[PDB]
Paper text:
RNase E is an essential bacterial endoribonuclease involved in the turnover of messenger RNA and the maturation of structured RNA precursors in Escherichia coli. The N-terminal half forms the catalytic domain (residues 1–530), resembles its paralog RNase G, and is relatively conserved among prokaryotes (Marcaida et al., 2006). The RNase E catalytic domain forms a dimer of dimers, with a quaternary organization resembling two pairs of scissors arranged in tandem. Between these two domains is a pair of conserved CPxCxGxG motifs, one on each monomer, that coordinate a single zinc ion.
Here, we present the first crystal structure of the E. coli RNase E catalytic domain in the apo form at 3.3 Å resolution. The quaternary structure of the RNase E apoprotein is composed of a dimer-of-dimers connected via the small domains but has substantial deviations from the D2 symmetry observed in the holoprotein. Specifically, each is twisted by about 45° in the apoprotein relative to its orientation in the holoprotein, and the tetramer is bent out of the plane by ∼40°. Two zinc ions are present in the structure, one in each pocket. In each of the four apoprotein protomers, the combined S1 subdomain and 5′ sensor (from here on referred to collectively as the “5/S1 subdomain”) has moved as a single unit through an angle of about 60° relative to the holoprotein configuration. This conformational change significantly exposes both the binding and catalytic sites to the surrounding solvent and probably permits substrates to be more easily bound to the enzyme. Additional electron density was identified in the 5′ sensing pocket in three of the four monomers. On the basis of the coordination geometry and the buffer composition, we propose that this density is likely to be a sulfate ion. This ion is hydrogen-bonded to the T170 side chain and amide group, as well as to the R169 side chain, mimicking the interaction between RNase E and the 5′-monophosphate group of RNA seen in the holoprotein structure. In the structure presented here, these residues are oriented as in the previously reported holoprotein, but no electron density was apparent near the catalytic sites, suggesting that the metal may be absent.
Numbering used by the authors:
A (entry chain A): 1 to 31, 35 to 79, 87 to 143, 148 to 308, 314 to 508
B (entry chain B): 1 to 9, 14 to 29, 34 to 80, 87 to 308, 313 to 513
C (entry chain D): 1 to 9, 14 to 29, 36 to 59, 62 to 79, 87 to 109, 115 to 138, 146 to 171, 176 to 307, ...
D (entry chain C): 1 to 11, 14 to 33, 37 to 78, 87 to 140, 148 to 307, 313 to 393, 401 to 506
Amino acid sequence: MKRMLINATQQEELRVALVDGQRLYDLDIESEQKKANIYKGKITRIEPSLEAAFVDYGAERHGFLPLKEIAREYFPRPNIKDVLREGQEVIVQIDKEERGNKGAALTTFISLAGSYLVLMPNNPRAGGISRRIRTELKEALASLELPEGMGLIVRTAGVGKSAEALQWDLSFRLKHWEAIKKAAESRPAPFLIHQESNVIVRAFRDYLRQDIGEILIDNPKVLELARQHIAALGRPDFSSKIKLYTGEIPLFSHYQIESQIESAFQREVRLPSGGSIVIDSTEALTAIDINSARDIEETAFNTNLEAADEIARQLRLRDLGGLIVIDFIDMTPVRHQRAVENRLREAVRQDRARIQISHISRFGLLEMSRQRLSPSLGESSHHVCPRCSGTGTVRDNESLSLSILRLIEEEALKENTQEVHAIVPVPIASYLLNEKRSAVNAIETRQDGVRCVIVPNDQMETPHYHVLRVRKGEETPTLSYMLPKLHEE
Amino acid sequence: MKRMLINATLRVALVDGQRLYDLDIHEQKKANIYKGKITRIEPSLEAAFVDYGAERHGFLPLKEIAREYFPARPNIKDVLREGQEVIVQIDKEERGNKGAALTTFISLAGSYLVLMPNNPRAGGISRRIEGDDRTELKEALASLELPEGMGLIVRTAGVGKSAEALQWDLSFRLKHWEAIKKAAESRPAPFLIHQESNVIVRAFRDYLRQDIGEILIDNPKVLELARQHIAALGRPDFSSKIKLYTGEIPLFSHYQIESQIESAFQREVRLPSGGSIVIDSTEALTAIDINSARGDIEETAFNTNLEAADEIARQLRLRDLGGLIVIDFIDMTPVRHQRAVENRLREAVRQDRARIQISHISRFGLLEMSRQRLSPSLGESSHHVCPRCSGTGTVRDNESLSLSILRLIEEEALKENTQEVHAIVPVPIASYLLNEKRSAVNAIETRQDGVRCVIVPNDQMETPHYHVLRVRKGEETPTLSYMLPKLHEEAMALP
Amino acid sequence: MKRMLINATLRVALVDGQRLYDLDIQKKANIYKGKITRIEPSLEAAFVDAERHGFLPLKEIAREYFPRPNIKDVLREGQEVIVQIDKEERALTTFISLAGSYLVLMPNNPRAGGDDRTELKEALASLELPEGMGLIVRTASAEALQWDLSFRLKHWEAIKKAAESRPAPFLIHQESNVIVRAFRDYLRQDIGEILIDNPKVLELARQHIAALGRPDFSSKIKLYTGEIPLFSHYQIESQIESAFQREVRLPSGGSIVIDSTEALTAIDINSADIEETAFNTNLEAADEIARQLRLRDLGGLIVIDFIDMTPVRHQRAVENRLREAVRQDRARIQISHISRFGLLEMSRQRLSLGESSHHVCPRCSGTGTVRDNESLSLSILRLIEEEALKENTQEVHAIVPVPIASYLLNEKRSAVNAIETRQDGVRCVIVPNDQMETPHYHVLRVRKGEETPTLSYMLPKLHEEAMALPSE
Amino acid sequence: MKRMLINATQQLRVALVDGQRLYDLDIESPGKKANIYKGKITRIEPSLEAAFVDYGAERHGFLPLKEIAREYFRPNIKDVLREGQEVIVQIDKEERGNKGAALTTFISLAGSYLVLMPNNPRAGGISRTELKEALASLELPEGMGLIVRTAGVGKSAEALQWDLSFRLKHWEAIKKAAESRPAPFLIHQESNVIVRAFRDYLRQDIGEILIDNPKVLELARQHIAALGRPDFSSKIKLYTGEIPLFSHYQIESQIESAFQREVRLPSGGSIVIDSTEALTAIDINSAGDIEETAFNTNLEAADEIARQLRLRDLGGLIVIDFIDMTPVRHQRAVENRLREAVRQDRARIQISHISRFGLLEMSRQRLSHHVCPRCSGTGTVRDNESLSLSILRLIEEEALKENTQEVHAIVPVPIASYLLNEKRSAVNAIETRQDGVRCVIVPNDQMETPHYHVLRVRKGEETPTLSYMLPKLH
Ligand SMILES: [Zn+2]
Ligand SMILES: [Zn+2]
């Protein structure tokens, strides 16, 4: 059975997992974003000067509706003064967030994005397959039963799919649209109809499919809200599937996903056979290295296939974006390289994100790209990494040392210098005073009379250090290792 | 003017003429050349033993003796006399018990050429060199004046130079080879003729070309050794060009190269126009990102990429970067820019001695390339991915992290047949779990009646890392809590 | 009065007046009535109903249940049977064995039974054992044995009475609940009361007594109710605290010092007529040491440095004191003489696994003395050079404590350089290691050819297997 | 080959070395008593029944009548001695205050095991069953007597004969050097630190004595002739290499082994030398056949222990926990191995067997830095268990106090681990019995294992500080 588990025992913090069995196969972790919210709005005032109008959609500031955005449905080359009345009600969607002094950009041409489809129930003039894409898709799109007054777009996401699966998405957009206009026809004008960005409506919109057997929710107050959204989205057949979790063992722990979730935070994730993948992220790209466990050709082939599967889901769970480079283990047969490519392609087939994959090159690398799905490059409860001090780069022991070494010498050059104390972490004092002993001696012999003291301090770690200057006369007879305390002041 | 500055108060920098364009900064024997006397012959091993000086005798198998020592499949007893003198090179250093592998087939490696003055049967362009590169090299090599009884090899390094530049390299090997057999004809048998690895001998062997005007040296004791090496290498035309630096301002500071040397240790290197390159290194490869400055867009991207290609080439030399390199060039829409950026990189690396191979800008806008670190020294990549992060700059809080491990613990304890669950966590995590969350740790144990939850503080880990191990019924040991990290040492280990 | 105090607010203390003389702080050998699930002539065994069925091989069926044969001939499916667990779930026998302190009754089967043994072979022949059964005398007098043998017989009766009174699947006897063990190990005829401070436990305590088959005792189990804690009211809490001290004061004023080393436990004896003092303090020591061995649960080898005595008759009297003082200890104990050096060597078998109170400082060899860093460095510094002089040496790695590396590579940097320069080509690597402290270090020699490009600070790990100690 | 190496380039160390096994060391560093002179009788005092002797000090020595040998003879001192009479004289007591030194013509030559009184036979004997048998077997000249030292517990008769004869050879040379000169000079210097080494460390099997210092080597030969053995002058040799003597002979590390707690054995096992209040416990760990390994490590142990006792100068009571051996014949062979290997030692040694417990007891007579952080300078550190239990009772005692809100136990990491796992139950028990009192046990990687803290937090003073942030706060 496929389940959607929703762990919501922090009422600010929120987790949604899809699960075939114990395949965690997709995850999301959530809760302002306002783009693509739908309101009923009253027209505040008309401006023939800007060929536009102003809409009270509930916000403290009025939205902005240009003429090019008004549907023929609301037209009772024309002046806007001839098209709209003041105080006229209108179903309105946000194109662009409020910026600076400027109210949100609003359009009546409403668009309902699904997983694979974007229904424009309001205008039929937009539609077709995307530029980014198509032979079977042009055949599958013509087969869907679309009402006459509307148009649809098939998202890059729609490409490895079937027509049967598209009809399921298209109909979920239709049921929603009915309810949008049903909840508009039922009220006075200033209110909100659809929230793009709250986590239940988004979870159902993105994560629901026909193969989903249950939706377990561990919080009653939420489960009630979850029902309401399902009827507003126009799918009662799902209410029966929504079920309340009540056990005292936590939802995600009862189903054994909490560790799999934990794997999306790790540098190294283990593969089923015993190998692993190491996910490093640079300024330019994300590098994924692959290591095997403890026939060589069969091992490399086997570990790569597992790697291809793990990388795929890690890309979903982590929500990784941009450029990705996979260093697959070397394989001599070309047929293996194809099978490792085709593994990865099938594994990323279920990913909603726009993903593009090349081959295994002559250097044994695979390049690919993924579009990060959410605007919020953000992390619910985190802090700056201390060791890298916020940037993701840690200075090699070589260069750190070399850097302090030039820094010591610059202090020894200064006039009136008696001594210079470098208080460094232990490995650095080890590297400086052995590997670089020659250069340490070179400084002291060139700065005749200047004491270079490099003291290993097990109280520091490797980004941190100190280089202190001791002027002629203020030197003490303190022992090298008792200095870190001395300079505690 | 081009100078070779040598700071030895050992660092060697090539300076045009206040710009710094190349830098160079283990008791070595492989590829030393001796005159040797034959100690004793072994027809049983089809080999002989040679006294080249060392406390242990070298090993010269029959397959290594040149026809120069032959008359007309023979027994080695018919070939050599005991105590017969012979010019000998070390193939392989002394390992364990054996003395050193020796061959009479001498080879003199230059920058671009390896002269085998001893045997003509082994020369040509190597297989590493792709056809379109080699095409002109097969033409340039046929044009060099090589004496009859000897053969050459064009190193992968030869790849970007000209026939006029190769003729300069080949002649330096010839001048040396002469002196090698002149110093051998002039003495009894047991001595050393050529030392492969003086940093002076190496610097001249690797870094001299006809375009080098001066060789400033700031150390007298070394300058004298430098002249001797020049005469021993057989090039008196360069003695005049070796000069003593004397100024009180350090050699490298007078020429303003010290900061440029400092750049080979930086993560981000400013380009001339304002943009930069970010050199990150990972486990697998070296990622280089390119950023631009501050207004034609296409021109900026093109122009920044060109500067990048030039900076990356020299940084690859100065850093001595090895292995796999991925360059993320700024995106360019015209294909003609993408070829120009590639060709910029090819012409910029053309003077690197290292074997370099460069592909195209792919559909993703990446350039893959490889480079051999030249030095037995294993290269430390200037910077690299933070291990606490994986290079996010972000780390989970201790609370969210404990709560996460909490449920992870309980998930393990709920598994059938579980006796114990061991959480090996960083010290402040065990502190938080076993104090602030003690109640909840107790709740697990009391709900999983019989399952021991062991949360052990481990001062060997820090805060993103942890471990949650499951102990099945019957395989628990009476080990103390604080001694579990050391016992699980075996397992918890990541490939 | 001898009491058994049970603090369960689980600790069990045997207390004579106000003297603490003993202290205590799985499914093998549990007994059930079981129904035979199904028979297997193939494995010559049967299955007995836990969520999983037990396994009863033919060799384990008593002659009592057979009304060389096949297992299908002996047993009927669904036949009830008194069953004991031989081995935990990873084995059932119908030979049952009831272990006491001194005796293991095999009430089912008499083909059992088991040269300090001279009086034991006589004492065992004197016990009144029913015909159909045999017994084993554990490693742990005849009058004291008859008390133990009868408590097993009382128990066995109740076991077959609780089986004759019910349907077939249930548990009869639980081998291991600390109350069962305390009554099994720590009950005797001379125990007047068993005070318990916890009602929930006292109730469980009574049930275990009737199950153990001794209703005469229920009267002697009493509930403690005072607000002053049970152990404090009886003044044993300090004596319990003495089991954790290095030095325990003797009645007369002398003391014993209990040190423990790697090999053994050294007990020294100090005092407060010289001959009479030594003799008398030694007698007091033999008493204290005996009960300290019980309270601490000390195991293995014990050497006792008694105060020296010149008359041989005192030495025997101090031995025989110690022998009779340990007589009540459950553990297997063996005692030798006071040797010509005035030591007494003895051994004790720790009853369950465990360790001791104080042992000897790793930092010293047990002195308190520790060489100054200056002297310690200079020592290592001459040691390093000694290694670099050796023929065929490529490198020499000093792995020293952090302050020693700091002293060596700063204050003594000149000398370190002097070694490297006089030993042309030999690398001195002095690595600071925050895993060591200051008496300890290592100086390792790296022959020509076997050097690795390992980083100075990573050597400690590369050298683990070769720098570890046969001590551990 | 057994050698005596003498390092004297440094201002003096003497090491007995067998092959390259340092087995004895002396570091005599010289700041009285038993010097021998030829002396002229300055003046006689019948008043004090004594005389005055010129032994060449600026002050005359004092020779009572009771100290004059029958050889030089109730009488007056005036009747026995003639003024200006020459006499072989030994110092009894160093010069004190105004008096000159006490002198006796009863002369005694101390060796390692024997004191020869070549002058008087009336003093000697014991106070042992075999020593009384062994002393009666020695060939001692009529006119003289001998004492067996406390050392001489550990002498064979053949070994005693070697000591006695070295005293006799010396005594001959003493009177030979007296007969050959006028009267005021010094004959034998007891104390000049080379004399001790030759007196304690020389024997017939010493091939060479290498000395790295000329000034000292000259002094070393004079002392040999004065000790009366010119046959050795040829065996004393000047070391000259730039490599220090003790480093050329590879013994400097073996000298440094005497300071360690564990010493590795040749085969790979080791011995652990731990010293308590009562005794020295030596434990033995091993590195195929198990019976052969245990036997073979124990043999090496016995050998190593023997010389460690010598190098360390351990004294008193020693208990050796040999690796268990089931065969009784090995037990005897490990015993006999120890006995033979201490046979060289100069100290008084006694050895029992391997007991039923597998332990060997033995005693040795001793022949002649800064407070440890970790045990506060006593013998003992606590077990993590006992320490934890100790802190645990201490935590509860703080929680009992009136007006307590919290009790913070700042312990080392392994202690926090043991307390909060193995003892978690008891930690809960305190908190639940002290309703409302928070027990905070915080692991602190800044401390190690003897140290800790238990702090009390009164009601109202508690902060919202995180557990692990409490070390810093405090
Ligand atoms: Zn980081
Ligand atoms: Zn200590």
